Amino acid sequence: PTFYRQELNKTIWEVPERYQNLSPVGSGAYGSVCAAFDTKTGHRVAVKKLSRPFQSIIHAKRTYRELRLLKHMKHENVIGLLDVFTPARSLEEFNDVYLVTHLMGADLNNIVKCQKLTDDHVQFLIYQILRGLKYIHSADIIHRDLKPSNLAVNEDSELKILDFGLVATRWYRAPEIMLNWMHYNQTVDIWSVGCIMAELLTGRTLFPGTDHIDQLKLILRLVGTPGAELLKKISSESARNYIQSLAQMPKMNFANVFIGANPLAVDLLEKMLVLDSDKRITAAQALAHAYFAQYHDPDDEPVADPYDQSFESRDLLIDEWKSLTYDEVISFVPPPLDQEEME
Numbered sequence: 001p002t003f004y005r006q007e008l009n010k011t012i013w014e015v016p017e018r019y020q021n022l023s024p025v026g027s028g029a030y031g032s033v034c035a036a037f038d039t040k041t042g043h044r045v046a047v048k049k050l051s052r053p054f055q056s057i058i059h060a061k062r063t064y065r066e067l068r069l070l071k072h073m074k075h076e077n078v079i080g081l082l083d084v085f086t087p088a089r090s091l092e093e094f095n096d097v098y099l100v101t102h103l104m105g106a107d108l109n110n111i112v113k114c115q116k117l118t119d120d121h122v123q124f125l126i127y128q129i130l131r132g133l134k135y136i137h138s139a140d141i142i143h144r145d146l147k148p149s150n151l152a153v154n155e156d157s158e159l160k161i162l163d164f165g166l167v168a169t170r171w172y173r174a175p176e177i178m179l180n181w182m183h184y185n186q187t188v189d190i191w192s193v194g195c196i197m198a199e200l201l202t203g204r205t206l207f208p209g210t211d212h213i214d215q216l217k218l219i220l221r222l223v224g225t226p227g228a229e230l231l232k233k234i235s236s237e238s239a240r241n242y243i244q245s246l247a248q249m250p251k252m253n254f255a256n257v258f259i260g261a262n263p264l265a266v267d268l269l270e271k272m273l274v275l276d277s278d279k280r281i282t283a284a285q286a287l288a289h290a291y292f293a294q295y296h297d298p299d300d301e302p303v304a305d306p307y308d309q310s311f312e313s314r315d316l317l318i319d320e321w322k323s324l325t326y327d328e329v330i331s332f333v334p335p336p337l338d339q340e341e342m343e
């Protein structure tokens with residue numbers, strides 16, 4: 001393919017003539033993103049150019065990690081790869097990596113910002129998040145920083161999770177992540193979903209804390225003071241002593257917090273916004289909840305193929321990560337344009 005150069009976001013992009021009319025649509029993880037027109041299929045796409053992907057072993061391994069993760073994802077509610085390219089003609093010149101996926105116009109903040117959402121619409125949005133989470137969790141991939149800005153949404157409210165498995169808002173983070181509690185499982189992401197759903201229903205951030213301590217206080221005012229058993233998970237004595245020292249707070253009745261909401265929404269929120277992660281509902285259990293009855297379809301809530309993450313434990317030299325990444329670029333096989341059939 002012939003490549004052309006264009007200055008975008010103050011740097012030179014080098015892309016195949018296949019992709020035209022590039023225009024910037026914001027930063028992404030470790031890179032910046034352009035919308036483009038794919039002349040081969042007539043589809044709109046988003047192209048992410050990774051920023052200095054082989055600067056250090058940290059950049060090199062995260063480049064490999066992101067390419068491995070995105071090549072594995074084949075789910076309608078999870079960002080996956082349509083293409084990956086480099087202008088390099090050999091490993092010796094290999095220095096830039098571009099990732100291509102379907103174009104999604106907005107993030108979830110652009111859906112809820114200037115719109116009073118209906119309950120049926122909130123159901124659809126949360127249903128999609130949970131469907132994608134069931135899929136990535138089934139491959140032992142956790143998001144760990146799920147938030148509205150990491151939920152890509154198109155013009156028809158179709159949603160995909162992005163930047164999974166990889167100063168930022170902490171308002172949606174699971175408390176065990178934000179506070180570095182010694183144990184955490186895949187339901188960290190379910191706390192985030194609760195936080196997002198609450199905001200879709202009320203138009204207000206649920207836990208808008210100014211710092212870690214302030215946010216924990218807002219959290220404990222909703223869910224109540226924890227039992228001694230959850231202190232088991234907290235390494236620092238100073239943090240444990242602090243929590244133990246706060247005046248006892250009862251759990252609030254969520255029906256008095258989400259006034260006038262679908263009682264089924266309140267019930268689901270009660271199951272998700274639980275301080276102890278071992279008591280939280282899973283994404284797969286949440287999909288069977290009556291709140292989603294009009295959308296739930298067991299035949300269309302698939303799990304993932306096994307995902308080999310053994311590379312995560314390994315320290316390799318920068319040129320080995322670079323070569324492994326080049327291998328994954330060269331071996332990529334684009335999906336068919338149409339991968340779905342009528343039910």
Ligand SMILES: Nc1nccc(-c2c(-c3ccc(F)cc3)ncn2C2CCNCC2)n1
Nearest residue numbers: 025026028033046048099100101103104107
């Ligand atoms: N507009 C749009 N459409 C799809 C994805 C993205 C995208 C990607 C991304 C990831 C992988 C890839 F291969 C290509 C692009 N990373 C961050 N974003 C965000 C850019 C602005 N915030 C919302 C989405 N942006």
Ligand SMILES: NS(=O)(=O)c1ccc(N2C(=O)CCC2=O)nc1
Nearest residue numbers: 201202203204257258259260261
């Ligand atoms: N925090 S609040 O008192 O501003 C508030 C705002 C909105 C709401 N709400 C509705 O109106 C419909 C569903 C829902 O949850 N509840 C509380």
Ligand SMILES: NS(=O)(=O)c1ccc(N2C(=O)CCC2=O)nc1
Nearest residue numbers: 251270271272274276279280281
């Ligand atoms: N997901 S759940 O519905 O099983 C569940 C489990 C436990 C709890 N909970 C606690 O842990 C302390 C207070 C409280 O209400 N809430 C919901």
Ligand SMILES: N[C@]1(CO)[C@H]2C[C@@H]3C[C@@H](C[C@H]1C3)C2
Nearest residue numbers: 205206207218219221222257
């Ligand atoms: N955001 C709210 C009410 O505005 C604050 C007060 C109380 C506990 C948390 C969650 C709700 C209810 C913080």
Ligand SMILES: [Ca+2]
Nearest residue numbers: 137186282283
């Ligand atoms: Ca899960």
Ligand SMILES: [Ca+2]
Nearest residue numbers: 296297300343
């Ligand atoms: Ca269906």
Ligand SMILES: [Ca+2]
Nearest residue numbers: 338340341342
């Ligand atoms: Ca089809």
Ligand SMILES: [Ca+2]
Nearest residue numbers: 297299300343
């Ligand atoms: Ca069917």
Ligand SMILES: [Cl-]
Nearest residue numbers: 072306307308
């Ligand atoms: Cl694999």
